[PDB]
Amino acid sequence: RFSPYVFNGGTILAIAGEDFAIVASDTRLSEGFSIHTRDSPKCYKLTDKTVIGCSGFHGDCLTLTKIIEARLKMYKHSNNKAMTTGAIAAMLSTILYSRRFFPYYVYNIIGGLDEEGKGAVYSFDPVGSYQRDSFKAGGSASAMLQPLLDNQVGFKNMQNVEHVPLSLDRAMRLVKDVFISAAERDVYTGDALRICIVTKEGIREETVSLRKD
Amino acid sequence: TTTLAFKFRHGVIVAADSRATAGAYIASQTVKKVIEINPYLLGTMAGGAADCSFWERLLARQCRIYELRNKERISVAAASKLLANMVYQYKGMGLSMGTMICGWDKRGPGLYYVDSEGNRISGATFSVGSGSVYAYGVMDRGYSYDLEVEQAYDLARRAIYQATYRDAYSGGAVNLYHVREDGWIRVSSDNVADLHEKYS
């Protein structure tokens, strides 16, 4: 038994704001007990309005993102407009299901703006189950990240707190904290955090150092 | 997952929990498990999430083409059979889908259970999913064809609630729908935490 899969690690995260989206990932690429490289981000630019995060089996991450790139140009050629964030998510669902009986071993989170200019996150399973979310963690350390987000962004289990809108600064401070906390415990998550911020002005990039052990 | 539906004098009630899991990990508490096939037909989702979404979205595609070709609403019987014939070709390949097709047509209120094993049956009441056994218990003890509308909404909602209590793999919120003669409506979304407050 040759196995066509191997786990290469990676943690991804997206947050939807009122007028922004964040997509964040660590930069470590692993195999077994080893590090392949410390500088392999998992975020990919799709359009001026849409970014995708991918982790899992790296062979599939590469193949799937190249397929998505080709499908975006084909769409643009047939229809004379860029694919919307929502249309990309709907398409990705069908691409993932096309391999239902030999899946892309990939966890995908799309972050971008929708047609009204608002933050949009869509999260996927490997065979294309998806929905829209306010925020979502995925990949290696998702079980470490998600609960704190449920608590701090969703205001869950909290009494007597005003459910205020999520500012970019606070969203940003959260993204850094959950990854730093994940880096303490998940052996796959480390090296550096890469953050993409999608706004009407475009896509900008912050990077924060994580533990190298 | 817990889902249920039943026919009664005033149409068909359809209810579901909202939980999704990957093993014991709770993946979501906000999943829409009732799918709007057209304005007078709902489909419900239990099993593999991608499998249900894909095949019911494909059912919807097919029902719409039918309507454009034939110049009339597809029947609940014909829609449920399109789904059965689609999935049959894939038996033993690992699809996991348990669905109810709920509508109102020329034969009145309609309700079919359809699944990846090949079953397609019509009936008065059904519950589907890991929690179904818990929902059958309360649903069966409260059901009657001559339920008043609000009593029927309370029964559906309680049956799902009770399933969420016993079954680890059901929870989130109960989402309730009503197929009437002039189309379905969305009647309520209640978080299970808020329902617990109420039922004691």
Partner: peptide
């Protein structure tokens, strides 16, 4: 992957 995920189940309902």
């Amino acid at each position: 992957i995920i189940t309902x």
